[PDB]
Amino acid sequence: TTALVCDNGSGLVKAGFAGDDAPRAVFPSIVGRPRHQGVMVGMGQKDSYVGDEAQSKRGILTLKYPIEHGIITNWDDMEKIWHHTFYNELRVAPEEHPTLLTEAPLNPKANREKMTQIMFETFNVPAMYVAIQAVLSLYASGRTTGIVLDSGDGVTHNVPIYEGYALPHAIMRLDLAGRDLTDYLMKILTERGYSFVTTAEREIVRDIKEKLCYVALDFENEMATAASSSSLEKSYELPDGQVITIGNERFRCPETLFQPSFIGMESAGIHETTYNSIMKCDIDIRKDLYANNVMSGGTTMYPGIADRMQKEITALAPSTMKIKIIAPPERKYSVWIGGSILASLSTFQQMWITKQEYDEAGPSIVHRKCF
Amino acid sequence: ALQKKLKGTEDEVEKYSESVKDAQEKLEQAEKKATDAEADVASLNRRIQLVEEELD
Amino acid sequence: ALQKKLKGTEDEVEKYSESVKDAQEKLEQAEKKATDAEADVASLNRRIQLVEEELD
Numbered sequence A: 001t002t003a004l005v006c007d008n009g010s011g012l013v014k015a016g017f018a019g020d021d022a023p024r025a026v027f028p029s030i031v032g033r034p035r036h037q038g039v040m041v042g043m044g045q046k047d048s049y050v051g052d053e054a055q056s057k058r059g060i061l062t063l064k065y066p067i068e069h070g071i072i073t074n075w076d077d078m079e080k081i082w083h084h085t086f087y088n089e090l091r092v093a094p095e096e097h098p099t100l101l102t103e104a105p106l107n108p109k110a111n112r113e114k115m116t117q118i119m120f121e122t123f124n125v126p127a128m129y130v131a132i133q134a135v136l137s138l139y140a141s142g143r144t145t146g147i148v149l150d151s152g153d154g155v156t157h158n159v160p161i162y163e164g165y166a167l168p169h170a171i172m173r174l175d176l177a178g179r180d181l182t183d184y185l186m187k188i189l190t191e192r193g194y195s196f197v198t199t200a201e202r203e204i205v206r207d208i209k210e211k212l213c214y215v216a217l218d219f220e221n222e223m224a225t226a227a228s229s230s231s232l233e234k235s236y237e238l239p240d241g242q243v244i245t246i247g248n249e250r251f252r253c254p255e256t257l258f259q260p261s262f263i264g265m266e267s268a269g270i271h272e273t274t275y276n277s278i279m280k281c282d283i284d285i286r287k288d289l290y291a292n293n294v295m296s297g298g299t300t301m302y303p304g305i306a307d308r309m310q311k312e313i314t315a316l317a318p319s320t321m322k323i324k325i326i327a328p329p330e331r332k333y334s335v336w337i338g339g340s341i342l343a344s345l346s347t348f349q350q351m352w353i354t355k356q357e358y359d360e361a362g363p364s365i366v367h368r369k370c371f
Numbered sequence B, C: 001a002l003q004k005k006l007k008g009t010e011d012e013v014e015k016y017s018e019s020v021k022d023a024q025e026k027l028e029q030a031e032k033k034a035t036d037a038e039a040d041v042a043s044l045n046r047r048i049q050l051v052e053e054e055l056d
């Protein structure tokens, strides 16, 4: 029977059926709760909205992402998210559906453990499995070799794969992603006079970032240009009129990914972590990796990010290797696409964790090669 | 006593390096403005479309 | 002796000339995309003011 593919991630839950071509349901992974008291009796106001419902009721709620950096911190809201997904987004009894779950590399072991335990006790699925987001994103790209640079909303990791083999000693995870870019934009938007502090209007800032921001091919030139001219200013209308205008910020914000010092982090930029991950691999496979940089995740969707990425990593690499960057136009869903592809296989139909097996061996079965 | 080909082919390599230098340099110089125009169209498409909906 | 380095030098002459050819090809293709993208941007950008004044 059909299998489910629920890619949790931060910021965006995307679910659907195995074998399909795109996730059916996509909604923000948030849980809102009213913060005023409510006076109209008979309104039967529920006590906890979730998903697009909360995203619409933003004005009177307090939103809580239950996944901070790839890891689940509030298990009750995560259970609400899963329950809502199954029973309303897909409208399917999870009793007879093996489900595929994803998680970033180098996560707390207890994360996937408790995840499996909940999936088997609360929802009582027949089987399940936890996969690495980067492997799936490589599946979707029709490749079998190449570093994959997944950069979701909470975490950013590189995974070098060659001939279907992963080199775990070179997996480089970095905790800078879309949420931090949103916060940095909220900060630097003050110096124009705009102040967004509410968890509700963090979403407004996220929309501004998704629409206007872009990566500059050369930071200094773009800075000097925005100084001289005004051909970079663009306006934007807030949910109550009062249009705003942002200039330098448009490329100041996503520049962080290449200079984490802007937000006070010490690690190297994206290009540099990529190059390092390359250099940690064996010398014989570095050319293919140079040729097969893959990009997934919504944060890699800035206009111009691939070009700047190529320029930087070209500057770092020798001048005789060829640098390419595989940026499909739907890369935001490459993880879910790869998940559907893998779940549709039959050579995979014996890698699931059968509920009987888990009852026999406990949630420790996850780390066991019944992965 | 057969070094003439050595000299000639060394100079061949030098001038070929010069030619690829110039060629690829102006090549990426072109693609910079190419992707510039790509951003131009990707922007003004959106702008024309939104002002068009405003007109509607 | 030096004849074998001469052999390798001739071979690299070949492949470098090939690189020059690929460079000129990508140059010409870049100018082609330049002409096309310029036609498109120019055709689609000079009209914003029309919708503007109409809705105005």
Ligand SMILES: Nc1ncnc2c1ncn2[C@@H]1O[C@H](COP(=O)(O)OP(=O)(O)O)[C@@H](O)[C@H]1O
Residues within 6 Å of the ligand: A008, A009, A010, A011, A012, A013, A151, A152, A153, A154, A155, A178, A179, A182, A206, A209, A210, A211, A296, A297, A298, A299, A301, A302, A332
């Ligand atoms: N068009 C866009 N431009 C820039 N950033 C975007 C765009 N679309 C989405 N994002 C960012 O990417 C994030 C969504 O990425 P996603 O792959 O869903 O993360 P996850 O895998 O953790 O769910 C959002 O938080 C948003 O900030």
